[PDB]
């Protein structure tokens, strides 16, 4: 029975066991559990040994007559045996034997009671037993995923039962330096991602990597290894802070050097803000295949998207200095030329946008106010390309209408409809650098960092034109030049670029919008790869913030960009620190709230903690409410984690704008502006529903402004959600007017969400990255933050240059193809086996040159699994030319 | 007291204190091995008090303090260290000969000038102070 | 406090339109003890009604969905009534009869809304 | 399992931080709020006069008056004057009133139907989509049909012409086609309406012509919108009484239907769906197309097409990979979906009996022979035929 | 997928009983729909309240 | 409307105090009927004093 002197007499029965698989248990329920406990001698504890052999069949059996009325509150109690009735870490050999039946016993408390609550309870008094059973341990993994016997219930059991090891929660020294890393990695991929982030270090990593590079040949094919390390990195942004997660993404670009599997490397590098790192790459590409093949097309298309090198796009240095070298290898003339630039997607968009005709417009309205807006929108909407470049060439109709700072943002627009392409122009940026009037040239000079993209060959000089007026004390002309060169190169820094902009001349209190153009470039530049290790080019952010307190708008603009010095790689954060250090100002301590929230971006760990909270708003004092507001809206997280975590994020944001909203009247203008631009870059969940149901909330809270934040993230598929958004705006902007200024940024609303009809998937993202950190996101954040209610705004907001592609040309292993391939498409997922954004092959298809459509429709599979054919590119309908191994070649149509 | 002064004062403590709590529920970083810097935070926030009781001999009785244990002289001239209704008790209490004016006869009950003690000096006494003619 | 229809506290006193619907028809209540003997017979009664109410997990388990329609046929004087009452006093859900009539629908007082 | 649980965690973790930061706003945090706004509502709630007598708002006059109904039995023609303008008063909404002279004092509160609150039932499918696959052509064209016009105006614009305005379910019950409804209306996020056809007739008379107008009507005003009719064969196959069965019945709410789709009525984007089991006891004129557009029909399970439809099922239960679907094909082939629902619950009803607390291939086999003969069973047998 | 709804449905569960009580405590927080070109209309208003001919009642 | 069911208790609780006595019913034949409509006023009425009969006659 359960009572005495049947397991604490050496005269005992192995009786118990005979009940408990269909009558009542009592030989896990409590017999082991009371014997345990029992006294302290550990000659009962020697008796429970004996019973284990009749309990292992005993197990199986009771799985298949399985009763879960008896599982449920019987199991619980055996908690109590194993670890606290033995201690576990004075007495190995005791619960390294119990184990053996028993270990899969617990596991069906932690199968049944699926939830999350549950699975870390149960963790803790695993990762301990676990760990003191070690070698034995192996054992017990290999019996489930055999299967125990075939039942429904063994499916569900083994990818719990893997887990336990894993935990590592509460761990003790005694047998914990081992690696497990091994025989759990090829079985089963949902275990894996756990143990680094709870190591939060360099050797959980160091060992995945090590294993990692022998799969390549030995476990399967290079492609499928590739595609177990992209789950791993992307659920690992949390229970793990920013400086030692940066730290795991330089070990796992050891892997991708070794593999011909190269995109993911370039993805991480954009975090770090390294040059080095596509240096090195180029020559590892090299060397590892003498062919051209998969490893050298997969680099290409990666870094084209955009890097560091300045503040946003893909720099023309590195691929110019390279190509002495690549220029000799010579695999093409015209492979090689295209390939390495953006300039496949460019030439396809350029002729099918001409047969369509996109004229990228805004109203055909003159002489007013109300077309100052008009002017910008025809460079917002043509931020993907256009060809409003023929009416433009005479510049009646924006430019001499325009005057101000509206003359200027203006006058980018003509260069903006010219970025992505292959010629910067040859009359309308050309000779608009030679067109009388500083308010055009200083603002076609804006135009002159946007035409050079991703592109390597910088079609228009942008660097030349500024080099010349930087050196010139006329202030326009600076403002302008610079933009262009943060804009022009990517987010860090030059060496020929960095010592140009040292001198200052710029503006330090100023009311204008355009003075803060400045900031953004020179805190970049600071930090380096490694940092500089210049002390010269921290002092210039200084100089600026030290003067302004006399413009609360300026006075914002500086701590964001002490802000972007801290971007970047660990080991990077510690060495521009004593540069740092020797001034002190008073400035800092209230910048130092939003600078921490944009350097502790890339993990939530850090990042979630200080964000909506308010630590430094009691707003009674200035200083407390220059950065804390922005802090709030949490602008910065969604990207940064995995797209489970963004799911929530939907339903926290739109009961956020509320709170901020009536808890502060100025960090509601401030705030709500934010919670636009955090929608299109996070890309929180659902899209049909959500810019309807938001445009009817918004007319409640205060600004006409929120209204043009707002349609940034209406954009997504482009003809999809957006023409929805615009005519339930427009009713409401056609309901009530008065005054020019409303009316104006209602233009701003309606026309700024369009690129419609035939004309591609453009939003916030590159397509592949999903772990990218903030650079691109400057430019319309800044212009989030300050006073909208100035025509000057925008310049900074006329380019969120961004492309995501609605090509599905893959390229074959030695095909190359550029005929386009179906897809299927699926909102949900059913597993988290799927977290690189594959989802299964049937769902709804979606077609070939046919509208990409983001969130509720975001992830994206090539539907061609049953004719085996596998991207190494990942699909989303990226900005990258995919690339493919093919086993079987392109799909046509099909019906449904 | 007054009202006005404690309301704004009030809600800019009171603001903070709650916004602590908030933090102190939120971990994740109970896994880190952080030496890189840029974080270096606990990322959690809370606050506390603790107070002693205390405060001598409050009142004898449940009734007013009257008469209490410790001997004092009071200086004449004095209401911001004054004389009581509860004090007539307390004059006496083995009155010294360095007070040059001590009883001579019984006591004045509440208020009035006491007896007193034939005065030999006036090192004690002080001279006269009236503000009678400087208020107008 | 009807000198301006204003609130004046939460009534503690909240009728239950279940409650009465199983009192006006009548139900005397029964337990396993007057059919006794005829144990097949209670434990299968036991079995649809008292796990799936109680725990849901169960089923979860078993796999088929908690119980829609369970169909209890068969001519009364066997006392089938009986054990039906005895399972849903103990698992506190109230037995509200209907003896094939609309009668004691009076939310429209017609079948086809007495669904929903 | 592990590498979610991180992710989990911390969501839920982010929305106890969101709840508990709305304390301290309420509280103790105000700026524009202050002790300002407290004696704004006492000194607005002296002047308008509590108790406020409610009143549905029908239109606004601009001149200073509204035609207001008093909710009390009788109405009155009030005037708009006191905290509110006659923009900021909307339709079809319960507004309040002085009440000791009735004066619009305005719209704080907004008036929902009663017809809609029994109907309505909330959008969302227990079979997740891409997993009630098996006639996975089929599923895709409902997506098309009703959810696509609404979604994606692009297509539409460039087709030209009028944007379709139904779909039809119909075939053999079990092809899920109730689980379709619900995804489309989840997507768009359209208010689903659900009434079951045998509402349509009821004991009292016209009720039928009557239910199904509103519905609509009120479709249009709460649109976008999906209607859900479920399973219309009730109108022939039930009756009360003569009147209830019988041809003016049936005429009624089929005539009813023909004017409100594309009649003189008409219906904007809003989309009907029905639900069918037969199309016998449906009219040509209702399976008509440009008041139903595409009809999907779905066919009985083809061998191939089973073993998804099963797989369904064993979703919803305990996953399967112990059972032979092949079993399954052999033993009954071109029968319903239905069949294969048939064949799970038998099986989790002898687990049920001893108390096995799971379902296994074991109980799927030993039921599976009982079920096909009971299949032809279920039709009468007779004394022996 | 019977392990994986689960954990899904737990999540949700705890999030969205969190929600009410915001929603519910939020409100529009003491304010006054009608805003400032109402409040001259408010003393109009109260002349009504004392005359007889207001309000008027529909009939036909 | 509610004045029906009311009737029916008003008789129970008078024949009760006035023992000895019998309630006799004739025709039942309209007190209960087969079919309530009740989207009437008068037919909801019908069906409330049908539902009060038994409920009283339980006691009796």
């Known amino acids: 029975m359960e009572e005495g002197g049947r397991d604490k007499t050496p005269v005992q029965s192995q009786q118990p066991s005979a009940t408990a698989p269909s009558g009542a248990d009592e030989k896990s329920s409590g017999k082991e559990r009371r014997d345990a406990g029992e006294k302290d001698k550990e000659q009962e504890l020697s008796e429970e040994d004996k019973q284990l052999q009749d309990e292992l069949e005993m197990l199986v059996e009771r799985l298949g007559e399985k009763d879960t009325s008896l599982y449920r509150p019987a199991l619980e109690e055996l908690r109590r045996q194993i670890r606290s009735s033995t201690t576990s870490m004075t007495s190995v050999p005791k619960p390294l034997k119990f184990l053996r039946p028993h270990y899969g016993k617990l596991k069906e408390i932690y199968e049944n009671m699926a939830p999350g609550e549950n699975k870390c309870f149960a963790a803790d008094i695993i990762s301990v037993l676990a760990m003191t059973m070690s070698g034995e341990r192996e054992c017990l993994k290999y019996r489930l995923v055999g299967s125990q016997e075939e039942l429904a219930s063994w499916g569900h059991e083994y990818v719990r039962h893997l887990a336990g090891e894993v935990a590592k929660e509460w761990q003790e020294l005694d047998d914990a330096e081992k690696a497990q890393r091994e025989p759990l990695l090829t079985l089963v991929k949902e275990i894996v991602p756990y143990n680094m982030a709870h190591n939060a270090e360099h050797e959980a990593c160091d060992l995945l990597m090590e294993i990692e590079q022998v799969d390549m040949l030995e476990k399967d094919i290079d492609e499928n290894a590739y595609s177990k390390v992209c789950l791993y990195l992307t659920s690992c942004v949390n229970y793990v802070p920013e400086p030692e997660n940066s730290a795991l993404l330089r070990c796992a670009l050891g892997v991708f050097r070794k593999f011909s599997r190269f995109p993911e490397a370039l993805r991480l590098a954009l975090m770090l803000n390294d040059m080095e790192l596509v240096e090195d790459i180029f020559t590892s590409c090299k060397d590892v295949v003498v062919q051209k093949q998969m490893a050298f097309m997969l680099g290409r298309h990666g870094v084209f998207l955009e890097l560091s090198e300045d503040v946003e796009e893909y720099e023309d240095l590195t691929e110019i200095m390279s190509n002495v070298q690549l220029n000799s290898n010579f695999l093409a003339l015209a492979r090689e030329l295209d390939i390495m630039e953006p300039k496949v997607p460019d030439d396809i968009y350029k002729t099918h946008l001409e047969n369509n005709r996109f004229g990228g417009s805004g109203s055909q309205v003159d002489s007013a106010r109300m077309n100052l807006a008009s ?295 401030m705030a709500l502006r934010t919670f636009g631009h955090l929608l299109r870059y996070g890309e929180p969940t659902l899209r049909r529903a959500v810019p309807l149901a938001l445009a009817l909330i918004s007319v409640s809270n205060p600004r006409l402004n929120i209204l043009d934040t707002l349609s940034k993230f ?34 701003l609303a309606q026309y700024h969400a369009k690129d419609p009809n035939n004309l591609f998937m453009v939003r916030l993202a590159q397509g592949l990255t999903h772990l990218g950190k903030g650079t691109l996101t400057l430019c319309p954040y800044h212009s989030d933050r300050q006073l909208m209610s100035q025509v000057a705004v925008a310049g900074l907001l006329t380019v969120l240059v961004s492309f995501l592609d609605v090509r599905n040309i893959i390229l074959g292993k030695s095909h190359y193809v550029l005929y386009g391939l179906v897809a299927a498409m699926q909102p949900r997922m059913l597993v988290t086996f799927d977290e690189e954004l594959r989802p299964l092959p049937v769902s709804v298809r979606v077609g070939q040159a046919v509208d990409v459509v983001g969130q509720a429709g975001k992830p994206k599979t090539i539907t061609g699994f049953q004719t085996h054919t596998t991207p190494v590119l990942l699909a989303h309908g990226e900005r990258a030319e995919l690339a493919t191994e093919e086993f079987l070649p392109v799909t046509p149509i099909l019906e449904g | 007291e007054v009202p006005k002064e404690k309301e704004k004062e009030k809600v800019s403590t009171a603001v903070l204190s709650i916004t602590a709590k908030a933090k102190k529920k939120e971990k994740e970083k109970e896994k880190k091995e952080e030496e890189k810097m840029e974080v270096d935070e606990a990322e959690k926030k809370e606050e506390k008090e603790k107070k002693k009781e205390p405060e001598p001999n409050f009142q004898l009785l449940d009734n007013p303090a009257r008469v209490m244990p410790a001997q004092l002289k009071v200086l004449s001239m004095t209401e911001t260290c004054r004389y009581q209704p509860f004090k007539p008790l307390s004059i006496g209490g083995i009155i010294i000969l360095k007070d040059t004016s001590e009883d001579i006869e019984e006591l004045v009950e509440p208020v009035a000038a006491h007896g007193p003690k034939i005065e030999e000096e006036e090192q004690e006494p002080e001279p006269p102070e009236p503000f009678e003619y400087i208020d107008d | ?91 506190d859900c109230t037995f509200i009869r209907v003896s094939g009539s609309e009668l004691v629908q009076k939310f429209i007082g017609e079948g086809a809304r007495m669904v929903r | 399992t592990q590498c979610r649980l991180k992710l989990l965690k911390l969501e839920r973790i982010k929305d106890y931080l969101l709840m508990e930061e709305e304390f301290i706003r309420n509280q103790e945090q105000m700026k524009p709020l202050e002790e300002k706004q407290e004696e704004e509502r006492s000194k607005v709630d002296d002047l308008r006069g509590t108790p406020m007598s409610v009143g549905t708002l029908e239109e606004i006059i601009d001149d200073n008056h509204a035609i207001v109904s008093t909710s009390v039995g009788s109405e009155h023609y009030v005037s708009i004057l006191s905290f509110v303008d006659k923009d900021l008063l909307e339709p079809g909404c319960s507004v309040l009133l002085n009440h000791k002279v ?191 557009d595409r009809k999907i029909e779905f066919p009985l399970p083809d061998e191939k097409t089973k073993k998804r439809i099963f797989q369904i099922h064993t979703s919803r239960m305990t996953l399967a990979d112990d059972v032979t679907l092949d079993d399954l094909i052999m033993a009954k082939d071109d029968l319903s979906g239905a069949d294969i629902k048939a064949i799970c619950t038998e099986a989790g009803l002898m687990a049920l009996r001893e108390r096995r607390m799971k379902v296994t291939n074991e109980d799927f086999k030993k039921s599976k022979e009982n079920v096909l003969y009971k299949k032809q069973e279920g039709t009468p047998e007779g004394l022996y035929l | 997928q019977s392990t994986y709804s689960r954990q899904i449905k737990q999540v949700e569960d705890d999030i969205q009983q969190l929600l009410k009580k915001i929603n519910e405590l939020t409100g529009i927080k003491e304010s006054d729909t009608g805003l400032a070109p109402p409040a001259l209309w408010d003393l109009a208003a109260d002349k009504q309240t004392l005359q007889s001919e207001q309000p008027l009642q529909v009939a036909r | 409307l509610g004045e029906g069911p009311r009737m029916v208790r008003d008789v129970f609780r008078l024949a009760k105090e006035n023992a000895p006595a019998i309630i006799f019913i004739d025709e039942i034949d309209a007190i209960a009927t087969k079919r309530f409509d009740a989207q009437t006023g008068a037919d909801r009425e019908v069906q409330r004093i049908l539902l009060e009969l038994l409920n009283q006659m339980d006691g009796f």
């Open chain 1, 714 to 747: 209406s954009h997504d598929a482009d003809p999809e959600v957006s023409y929805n958004s615009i005519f339930a705006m427009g009713m409401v902007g056609s309901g009530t007017n008065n005054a020019r200024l409303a009316a104006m940024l209602r233009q």
């Open chain 1, 375 to 669: 002017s910008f929108v025809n460079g917002f909407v043509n931020a993907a390309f256009g060809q409003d470049k023929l009416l433009t060439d005479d510049g009646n109709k924006w430019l001499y209408k325009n005057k101000d700072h509206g003359m200027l943002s203006a006058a980018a627009s003509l260069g903006m409809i010219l970025l992505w392409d292959v010629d910067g122009g040859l009359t309308q940026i050309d000779k608009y650098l030679y067109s009388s009037e500083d308010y055009i040239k200083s603002g076609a000079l804006l135009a002159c960092g946007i035409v050079n993209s991703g592109v390597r060959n910088e079609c228009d000089p942008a660097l030349a034109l500024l080099s010349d007026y930087v050196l010139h004390n006329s202030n326009t002309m600076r403002l302008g030049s610079i933009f262009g060169l943060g804009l022009a190169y990517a987010g860090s820094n030059r060496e020929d670029v960095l010592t140009l902009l040292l001198p200052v001349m710029g503006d330090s209190k100023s009311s204008m919008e355009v003075a803060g153009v400045t900031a953004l470039a020179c805190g970049m530049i600071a930090v380096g790869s490694c940092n500089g290790d210049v002390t010269s080019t921290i002092l210039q952010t200084i100089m600026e913030k030290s003067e302004t307190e006399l413009k609360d708008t300026y006075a914002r603009w500086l701590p964001l960009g002490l802000g972007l010095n801290h971007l970047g790689k660990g080991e990077a954060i510690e060495a521009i620190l004593a540069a740092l250090e020797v001034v002190s100002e008073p400035f800092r301590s209230f910048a130092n709230t939003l600078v921490d929230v944009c350097a502790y971006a890339g993990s939530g760990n850090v990042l979630k903690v200080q964000q909506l909270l308010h630590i430094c708003s009691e707003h009674f004092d200035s200083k407390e409410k220059e950065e804390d507001k922005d802090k709030k809206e949490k602008k910065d997280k969604d990207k940064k984690e995995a797209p489970a975590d963004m799911g929530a994020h939907q339903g926290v944001a739109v009961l956020g704008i509320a709170l901020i909203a009536m808890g502060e009247e100025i960090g509601a203008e």
């Open chain 4, 102 to 292: 009735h004066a619009v004092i305005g719209v704080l509160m907004d008036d929902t139907d009663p017809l809609v609150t029994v109907m309505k039932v909330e959008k969302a499918p227990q079979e997740t989509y891409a997993d009630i696959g098996g006639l996975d052509n089929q599923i895709q064209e409902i997506k098309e049909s009703v959810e696509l016009p609404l979604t994606h105006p692009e297509y539409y614009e460039e087709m030209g012409i009028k944007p379709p305005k139904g779909v039809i379910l119909y075939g053999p019950p079990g092809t899920g086609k109730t689980l379709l409804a619900k995804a489309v209306a989840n997507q768009t996020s359209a208010t689903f309406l659900r009434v079951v056809g045998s509402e349509l007739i009821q004991k009292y008379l016209g009720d039928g012509p009557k239910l199904v107008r509103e519905l609509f009507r009120v479709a249009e005003e709460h649109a976008p919108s999906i209607v859900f009719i479920d399973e219309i064969d009730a109108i022939g196959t039930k009756r009360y009484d003569s009147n209830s069965g019988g041809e003016r019945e049936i005429q009624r709410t089929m005539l009813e239907l023909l004017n409100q789709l594309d009649g003189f009525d008409s219906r904007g984007d809003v989309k009907v769906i029905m639900a069918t089991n037969r199309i016998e006891t449906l009219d040509p004129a209702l399976i008509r197309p440009g008041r139903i």
């Open chain 3, 1 to 91: 406090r009807n000198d301006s229809y204003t609130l004046h506290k939460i009534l503690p006193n909240k009728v239950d339109p279940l409650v009465s619907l199983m009192m006006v028809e009548k139900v005397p209540d029964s337990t396993y003890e007057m059919i006794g003997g005829l144990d097949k017979q209670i434990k299968e009664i036991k079995e649809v009604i008292e796990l799936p109410v109680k725990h849901p997990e169960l089923f979860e388990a078993l796999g088929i969905a908690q119980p829609k329609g369970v169909l209890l046929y068969g001519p009364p004087g066997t006392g089938k009534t009986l054990l039906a009452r005895a399972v849903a006093h103990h698992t």
